[PDB]
Write a structure and sequence with these properties.
The PDB classes it as metal binding protein. This protein is mainly beta. The protein has one domain. The strands form three sheets. It has a two-stranded antiparallel sheet. Strands 2-5 form a two-stranded antiparallel sheet. It is globular, with a radius of gyration of 13 Å. It binds zinc ion (ZN) (3 copies). One zinc ion binds next to helix 2.
Length: 109
């Protein structure tokens, strides 16, 4: 099941997490970086030092643009599966289309 056109394309940084916690902008607030399903959290996401000392530290990890306000938490489901154990949860895949394929009269995000 899966391993095809159900990837989600969660291309994330996945390096070695540092001390700096991954911040979410209110627009991605509540979203689990690994899956995005507004489900029970568990542990604050740690961004890799490469990102911490790489300018992209305070800015939201999910939409890597707007500054983050709340630390992201890995959802229990991702923790159970063991996706969080990979590393830095910075979403890289997101160049545009914050979610799905709709801006719907909201600039783009
Ligand atoms: Zn998750
Ligand atoms: Zn990183
Ligand atoms: Zn965001």
């Amino acid at each position: 099941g899966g391993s095809s056109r159900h990837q989600f394309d969660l291309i994330m940084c996945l390096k070695q997490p540092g001390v700096q916690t991954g911040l979410l902008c209110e627009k991605c607030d509540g979203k689990c970086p690994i899956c995005d399903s507004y489900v029970r959290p568990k542990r604050k996401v740690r961004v890799c030092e490469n990102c911490s000392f790489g300018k992209q530290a305070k800015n939201c990890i999910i939409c890597n643009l707007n500054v983050g306000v709340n630390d992201a938490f890995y959802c229990w489901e991702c923790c159970r599966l063991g996706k969080d154990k990979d590393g830095c949860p910075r979403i890289l895949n997101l160049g545009s289309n914050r979610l799905d394929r709709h801006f719907e009269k909201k600039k783009k995000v």
